[PDB]
């Protein structure tokens, strides 16, 4: 890849992320995007995180980071939000 940009968001065994098409409205499930880190596709994408230790139905999916393609550099990156919460380890 060597393009970084907006990666598919890897699985780390604690959480996972999903890619949604942000369309002028939050929390809205848009069309799913394709390609991986060896693709580097920039999208104003919303990631939903769930804790593997927690059941999918327990979490209503909360967004912890957003992606945005930069008009100046042309690259895309994930933005970490402040005041984030924590889920139980076990």
- Whole-number Å distance between alpha carbons of 67 and 71: 13
Residues 6+ apart with CB under 8 A from 49: 15, 16, 17, 59, 61, 62, 63, 64
Q: Report which secondary-structure segment, H or E, holds 61.
A: none
Of 57, 47, 52, nearest to 81 by C-alpha is: 47
- Name the nearest CA neighbour of 67 among 86, 40, 85: 40
Element (H, E) at 19: strand 19-21
Give the torsion sign (CA, 22, 23, 25, 27): negative
Question: Determination technique for this PDB entry?
Answer: NMR
From CA 28, how far away is CA 23, in angstroms rounded? 7
Q: Residue 90 and residue 81: Cα distance in Å, rounded?
A: 24
CA 73 to centroid of chain Cα atoms: 20
| 62 close to 73: Cβ distance less than 8 angstroms | no
Q: From CA 13, how far away is CA 2, in angstroms rounded?
A: 24
Enumerate the domain spans of the chain: 15-80
């Amino acid at each position: 890849g060597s393009g970084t940009g907006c990666p598919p968001l890897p699985d780390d065994g604690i959480v996972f992320y999903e890619y949604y098409g942000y369309a002028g409205d939050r929390h809205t499930v848009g069309p799913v995007v394709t390609k991986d880190s060896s693709g580097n596709y920039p999208s104003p994408t919303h990631a939903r995180r769930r804790c593997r230790a927690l059941s999918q139905e327990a979490d209503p999916g909360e967004f912890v980071a957003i992606c945005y393609k930069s008009g100046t550099t042309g690259e895309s990156h994930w933005e970490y939000y402040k005041n984030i919460g924590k889920c139980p380890d076990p």
